[model samples]
Target: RTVLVLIPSLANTVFLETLTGIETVLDAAGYQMLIGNSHYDAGQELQLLRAYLQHRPDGVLITGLSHAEPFERILSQHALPVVYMMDLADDGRCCVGFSQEDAGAAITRHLLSRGKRRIGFLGAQLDERVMKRLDGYRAALDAADCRDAGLEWLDPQPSSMQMGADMLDRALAERPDCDALFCCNDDLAIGALARSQQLGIAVPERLAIAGFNDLQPAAWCTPPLTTVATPRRDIGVHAAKALLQLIDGEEPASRRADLGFRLMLRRSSEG
Candidate 1:
């Protein structure tokens, strides 16, 4: 027996750990895995889906709750056991993930609690999860009466340290008064922190920085990044458990699972 697994990007450590969960369960069940890397592209995902479907996998454990229309339409034609990971939707589908928006707002509130106003958001790739985080940031700032549209800096490309360094320059040039920044990902936050030192802008005194995903480097860097710690490996394990239930012709207790996130408040936002 074989199962198909699709992930947006293998380069992301989030998915790597998730794969561990999926593989651990599937291997225990004596199922072979056919993994595909979508590279965060809908077209690639669609093609991978079609090509892999030929093997007639017993089930599929996929990343994300939404996808391009063709990918959805083609996948709909199959009656395979499907379990979505990394995000949740109310469509009654078997899904597992945390609330990105809620986590985003919680981190922003941390900055606000420290009396930091004029908060800026730095984002890259602008994926659905990132957009949801932006919504949370807006909600938190709106509640605090500190929401400023001019403080957002987003890039359409994948997130990286170079982009973060550049965006730091642009964000400061554009909003010299911004006292805090919430990066969509830890890479950007780390890069911004490194750049801040070079620019002689004292962190927490001049600007507080926070990020998402709580990547490994976040804790190692100077002043340690404040970020949202997600349950990526747990999402994978539970999603695969649900899929296994489906494959076994048993009903899972719930069709959706909401694993919550934790705010890692480190020295970066201690102001």
Candidate 2:
């Protein structure tokens, strides 16, 4: 009867952008897009998953990788099509997003090329994708014999500029020699640069800052911060429409849909 969509939150900008395209496509196709937000607690996800399946959905969409263990068994019996966005899961499943690990490693390598010896990882809302990003960070740096990483893990929550700054403070205290910070996302990166300024640490010169999902603010901020950007805004509109067609008949030729993305360099990285 409908397409059941489950996300972390409407306030989550990244997911917000993803869901908007889904909703837009489904709306045109005349399928109702019902949404549920678990915000990371698998318990809540299970409840919603159960409740929606009762309504007999045409398909279901879940963001990120985490799911309550027993829930998959129930899904087997339900026989509903499911599409997972963000992160990659093996064992043959349908997905429409890229690898967090690869993206993370890409950002880390960028910082390393700048001769940053001790790179700090500032992460929050430690979900599967975020943790995978950490995996990439550790893997990339250790290969460079630069495993002296400053790690700042935080409670999972919505992205906030303050998170970036706070994590930078904690990372600096933990790794005083840290010269570059790879924040979990743009929110934290922006905050990291702000904190660097507060501490009188010169960006790019003394500390390089980079973030993921190059949100608009990342470009406008002072000394413009570098970031990994997934396709968003108007271009995202059409790509997600394709994801909808795939969701209805989504394939598994490979894992991610690979919408095509890029890394943006700005003053902060240069600083």
Candidate 3:
């Protein structure tokens, strides 16, 4: 039996890596797989879901949470065995991924432990993952008795070096007192780090930076990036394994698994 996998966008390397991991695991189990793209469009996601249902794949794997009510209702109605990756949706569906909430909280605590107060945030508005990190930021600040800290928000843009550099400039311009910055992801952190070098800002002395999702480049960036290490490959392996269990009519334990996260403290946030 083949499993139909639905992903938001294949343009990102992280998403592609997830697909590769999933394919490797499922193929080893002798299960065929089919792939589709929603391109971050609700209408397209719905269309893909409808098509998948018609074909009736043995299992489904979704990357992120879908907000469309009708699309969610359709999933609920199908009684399909689905495994979700990345973000979590509390619809009683089985999902295997990291908790963005915990990821956010952990990074925030790490920054605070290093005596970083006045931390600014940067990331796209469209991505739900960023919002989860923001919530973590707010929660951490509140816990640290600094609920009124300054925040700089950037409009939704493709995760690229340019976006990171641009947002860092804006953040410094508006919040020069900010000692720490928590970017939405590692890509933005790297860009920000480069921009800071151009502006002659001494990292951790004048400013500290942290990012989520410890992507491969995070470690190689200038000063290196302090980030939350998300288990991307492990998520793919677990999601695939859970889906296979469902296909085999075995009672799989727990839909939601908090795979856990770790804070990789690098020179970027060390004083």
Candidate 4:
């Protein structure tokens, strides 16, 4: 049997790590894995699904809950077992991942606990997942009565180290009083940390910094970054196993597996 895996992109280490888990589990279960990269485009994703369906895979594991309508329509046509990854759905769709908004809120609440009253949100790509994190950030600050909409720096460009530094510069220039910054991902947060050093900004003293996706470099920074450690690999393992259960004509114990996330408190947000 074979499982077709469709993800937004492998560029982000998060998905790459998730794929690693998927491959490990499926390989042990005697299933061949067929991979597809959607490049974060709905049209491209739809095309990939259409093209892969011709091969009649035993099951399919997709990245998110939402898809280009026809993707679902065609999937229904095939009647194959499908599992969504990196997110959870209550609509009876099998999924494995944590709440993005909850993870975002947890990180923001940590910053707040460290006495950061004016935290700025720096986000790139502005994708659905990123926007959910922003919602979490807003919710946490709103509950603290310190929600400052003006401090949001959302960029449409894909996330990267240079973009992180650039956003930090612009965010600081526009809101000099921001006491803390929450970057949407580790790449941006890492860049922001490096740039902060160049600008003589003392982290956790003058400003605290936080990021999401607890990537590898998140810990090696001069002042290790505070971030949300998502269970990307575990999500992959669990989601693939769930798809396998479905392939075997057995109902998974749970259709929606909320793997959850952890707040990795570090020196960067220790202020």
- Once superposed on the true structure, which residue ranges of model 3 sit more than 4 Å away at CA? 52-56, 76-79, 89-91
RMSD of each predicted structure: 1.3, 2.9, 2.1, 1.0
Error of 2 at 61 (Å): 0.9
Off by over 4 Å in 4: none
Best by TM-score: 4
lDDT of 3 by residue, 172-232 (tens): 8887888888888787888999999899999988889998778888999889889988887
Clashes found in each candidate (C-alpha, N, C closer than 3 A): 0, 6, 2, 0
Order of models, best TM-score first: 4, 1, 3, 2
TM-scores of all candidate predictions against the true structure: 0.96, 0.87, 0.91, 0.97
Ranking by lDDT: 4, 1, 3, 2
Residue pair clashes in candidate 3: 94-255, 95-255
Task: Summarize candidate 1's per-residue lDDT along 1-271 as a digit string, tens digits.
Answer: 8989999887656577788888888899898888989888888888899999889899998888768777766766787789998888888888999899999899999999988999999989888899999999999999988888799887899988888889999999988898999999998999999999889998998999998998889999898989999988888888888898999999976788999999998998994
* Candidates 2 and 3 compared by lDDT, better number: 3
Ranking 2 against 4 by lDDT, winner: 4
Candidate 1 is scored at a TM of 0.96
* Candidate 2 structure quality by residue, lDDT tens digits, 32-131: 8788888667999899988877677777777766688987887678776666776556756656666678888888899999888788887788877788
| lDDT (Cα) of model 4 | 0.89
In candidate 1, position 78 carries an lDDT of: 85
